[model samples]
Target: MLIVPYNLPLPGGVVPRMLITILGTVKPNANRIALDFQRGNDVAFHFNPRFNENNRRVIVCNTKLDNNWGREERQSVFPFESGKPFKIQVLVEPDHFKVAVNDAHLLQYNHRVKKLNEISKLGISGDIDLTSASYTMI
Candidate 1:
């Protein structure tokens, strides 16, 4: 019933051996959208897709800790298209997070915040229409 720029809490926080799933569509003329997992003030992972930046499209991933952003991991191969639906899956691991888009492996992001259990917040924002978001413990 809600729209983008949304935030919600996970029932028991994130941990290894679990999966997070999100389905949405990129609105036309969208520049970017972000899917983030957070532990209070720090971001565990930041997944971003940019439709156009300096005429070059990319997907950027990173983590934010102590209010400072770490090095950005940019993927030049954009997998999302405007006005199209997308499925993103994040598999939690002890040391990192494995991500996939449209059922294909996309990237792996190492854990910046060592305590996964503290990551209880899911945030989404920007030019996209989120249809569903859920998680399952394995």
Candidate 2:
């Protein structure tokens, strides 16, 4: 089983036309799970799936730079649930990221940290068990 809070070096770093894929199962009582594209301590993209807070399911995307988080980009598409397997894909476009959950288009997040190549790591954590996490040029 893949460890929680797992991290992998992004081969060739982040670039346009790249696709990041994650397969996982959410814990039955999961509160949240997060995926991050990072460079050292700075996060290029923060993808968070939230549950149980006020009984709302939310997907929040944002960037963290210089230890501060930027404005959140929230989506209302609640395609994930507890105790179920899920597939998430983030496609790196020239100026934004196009994300899909369970083969359905979810959201588009514009680049806040514009230097994509500086993002060298992919991180996963919180209330989910990963089956696979990988990247490819697309």
Candidate 3:
């Protein structure tokens, strides 16, 4: 398991860029998980597999966003508010990460980093208070 604490402040902007990642080996064909902000929400969680640009996969969730950004889907389970502290749990699998937020929602993100051997790194970052960030192998 790995955990990192940061006091870095975000630049002046509605959309701030922050990331916390883990470095380790993952299944070549497993899933990836992430807890992050969704547009203007704070409790957004993402889960999926690493796919090539040519791959076409849809992201399905329980809740829906107000607007569609022209992706496959915009369904989400929880509505994340801005500037709120939350937790992101990532389950590193052989090929992907199974992600959950605040122990209530799940999402997926493809390991876009290509070479599976280079995906041992995990990360998390946002515009909110990150109390803790950690990962474990199950």
Tens digit per residue, CA lDDT, model 2, 56-126: 89888999889999999888778998999999999999989899999999999888887777888988999
State in Å the error of residue 77, model 1: 1.8
Q: What is the lDDT of candidate 2?
A: 0.89
Name the runs in model 3 displaced over 4 angstroms.
1-73, 110-114
Best-matching candidate per TM-score: 2
52-91: candidate 1 lDDT, tens digit per residue = 8889889999999899999999988788999999888989
User: How does model 3 score by TM-score?
Assistant: 0.40
Off by over 4 Å in 2: none
Deviation from native of the Cα of residue 74 in model 2, angstroms: 1.1
Lowest lDDT sum, 10 consecutive residues, model 1, at 1-10
| Alpha-carbon RMSD to native, per candidate | 1.2, 1.0, 14.6
lDDT, candidate 2, at 138 = 71
| Residue 68 accuracy (lDDT) in model 3 | 34
TM-scores for every candidate against the unseen true structure: 0.94, 0.95, 0.40
Question: How displaced is residue 99 in candidate 3, in Å?
Answer: 1.0
Better of 1 and 3 by lDDT: 1
